[PDB]
Amino acid sequence: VDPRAKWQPQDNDIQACDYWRHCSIDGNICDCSGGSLTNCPPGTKLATASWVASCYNPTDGQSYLIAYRDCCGYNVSGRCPCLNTEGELPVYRPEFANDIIWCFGAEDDAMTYHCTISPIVGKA
């Protein structure tokens, strides 16, 4: 609803695109395909790389630094797709660029995009 409106995080449903940690998610939530909010689904490869974002936790009024690591080596799940860009910068500032495939580091050289986790990597 109003794709152009200010972002408004919630903290009650991790499979929804307005869940507070997915502020900078691009792709699909791992929770919808066998993974978890922070673990990869069976069979996929955990990347070492990621893009970061600092997202507001409406519940505690704090901000944490989210490391969007991709689970790879699989075709896109197709379930629960999102594209949030809270503070996303251009490609020439990768640490904060979300169109890049952050699969670097996955075992076996997996570079195909399956889903993305939203683990907290630290405040603020």
Number of domains in the chain: 1
Q: Taking the CA of residue 27 as centre, how many other CA atoms within 13 Å lie in the half-sphere pointing to its CB?
A: 30
Contact status, residue 5 vs residue 46, Cβ threshold 8 Å: no
Q: Which domain holds residue 122?
A: 1-124
Q: What is the resolution of this structure in A?
A: 2.8
Rg (CA), the chain: 13
Contact status, residue 71 vs residue 28, Cβ threshold 8 Å: no
Q: Which of 26, 31, 70, 102 is catalytic?
A: 70
Q: Which of 20, 26, 31, 51 is catalytic?
A: 51
Residue 70 known to be catalytic: yes
The experimental technique behind this entry is X-ray
CATH of the domain at 100: 2.60.30.10
Residue 109 known to be catalytic: no
